[PDB]
């Protein structure tokens, strides 16, 4: 129950806000979508357990995903851009400590690191 | 390159800083390590390319993850925490748009979003 | 979106108004309902997209459905009345032109023409 | 027996009227067609029963569809635009109600609705 | 289409307020959730139609269910506490009468009566 | 040990009073009855142990139901109305918090909630 719209601000805090709408909601998941003249945006949210095992620990998994598709033009076919995050932690763990992670990762990644990553600079 | 030491600031800005070190670099990927008495920190950065197929678009993938492990104490067994992201785009795509999408995804996620997401809100 | 309530004005403009309520949402579909002592109202909205084929044009379908149900009384058994529309167009098409075609189809249909169509003359 | 020409006013009551001509009349069915420099129009009208089998109500069907095609230009291949309505009701039913329903549906659909469906809102 | 949040006031009117959130609603049902340090709240709403058997009346079930669970602390293991209501009526009945019966049931229940029932006096 | 007469006020507070009479009580169960010219009223109360599972918590249930019957009149056959609630919790628990949960459930249901719930809203 995050809201009726999801706002995507391309270029970080730069600007160019996009406001997606629910399209679907099933199985603790959500669909967001919005089309434009030359492309479209899609947002996805999921939650899930892992299969129970006799004596190993039980975990829960979360992820969020963004996707953009650009329609074919000229002789160039159709292609998409994607970007998503995942979090995995044990059942019953402390919320604040797991929240420290993920947030640390988000603070880590910024424009320069994204540029370096694009350059295969491991 | 990307640096010899990586800093993880648990809790985002103004938090506690942990510094890792290079250990290995094989198979287009590199990993970082830091040991401690009660737990440890590890990081990996990897790049990969999907196989060529006679007629479809060719894509590149970037993945970055954080892992934290807690050693068993008393009755409590081993357990772990992770959090990672992936970026996927076509080989010839302009880098700036991919960077902008990644910056948007980074900006969206923050403490309130992580709390709600742990709350199983979809 | 589309609102929580859906209004049917039986008999076109200036007629009798019925107000259905949403009661479900699954599989990219929505359903509306209303109880009556002698009948019942349904309303359904469905969306669909065809899968990808090697070299073909990809299409999507939009459907809107109205149904009337009358409970069996005396000798007369159960029977229903129904009326629905469908829209189909390609993934990257321009919305405005499809909308204009839909407006044309809606404007062509009217009371006298329905009375003619029930007359079996092609 | 609708007439020797069928008129389609693109954009609803706005303007841009097209005039098709009958091409055929076979088996309770009719066709209309009109060629142009870069596109064509076509309309069809059909009526049918259903297969009978023991102790059920017997039903009727009226179908009307609009079809629009655009010829290949440059790299972009051919594609079509379609929009059609179907009416179903029982033999011997009262005509005025079957028209009041159906004309209510015609009144419901307009610019805003078609925009919503193209937006995938349900 | 109840709403985006549910309010539970423990101890009847004038008590402590608790706010639940959407997590899911697929099969005409709904489910709510909220976590706490030592407990969690869950609320679920269901609709169902009883099995059809020829030449007999048709009925409808509506169910509303509250659950509260407390996490184990030492020797004491998990244990749970729920209270739920059910309403059954025939299809096509009058809403007002069923509502009045339910209101009478609700008005009969109160502080003293729950104390008596938990006192086991038949 | 409730008493000799149970009062049902159809329509909640300020409604029409109906006084029932005790008829029987054998197995920790009690029921009340009243006949009428066109209907009939009945109430019941039950208590029971849940089955004992080796090395798990032990639970007990309190149940109460209202039933309303309308005799066949001409074409219309027999039909009935009901409304009942159930309480479950473990042995040795504190009665007052359980009363509080029942109080919350009872306070939630009222005019509007019943009106919307009978409309199949979920
Ligand atoms: Ca930028
Ligand atoms: Ca924090
Ligand atoms: Ca190496
Ligand atoms: Ca009319
Ligand atoms: Ca227009
Ligand atoms: Ca002919
Ligand atoms: Ca109290
Ligand atoms: Ca759903
Ligand atoms: Ca009332």
Residue numbers in the entry:
A (entry chain JR), B (entry chain JW), C (entry chain JQ), D (entry chain JL), E (entry chain JS), F (entry chain GO): 1 to 122
Direct quotes from the study:
Caulobacter crescentus Tad (tight adherence) pili, part of the type IV pili family, are crucial for mechanosensing, surface adherence, bacteriophage (phage) adsorption, and cell-cycle regulation. Unlike other type IV pilins, Tad pilins lack the typical globular β sheet domain responsible for pilus assembly and phage binding. In this study, we use single-particle cryo–electron microscopy (cryo-EM) to determine the molecular structure of the C. crescentus Tad pilus and comprehensively examine the molecular basis for the interaction between Tad pili and ΦCb5.
With our cryo-EM map of the ΦCb5 at a resolution of 2.7 Å, we reveal insights into the RNA packaging within the mature ΦCb5 virion and the arrangement of the Mat responsible for interacting with Tad pili. The ΦCb5 virion showcases a near-icosahedral spherical Coat shell of 89 Coat dimers with a diameter of around 290 Å, while a single Mat extends 30 Å beyond the shell. The Mat of ΦCb5 measures 135 Å long and 30 Å wide. It comprises a structural framework featuring a large β sheet including β strands β1 to β8, β10, and β11 and designated as the β region, as well as an α helix bundle, encompassing α helices α3 to α8 and designated as the α region. In addition, we find that the N terminus of the Mat is exposed externally on the capsid, affording flexibility for potential protein tagging and engineering at this site. Stem-loop U1, the final RNA helix within the gRNA genome, engages in extensive interactions with the inner surface of Mat β region with its tip sandwiched between Mat and Coat dimer 2.
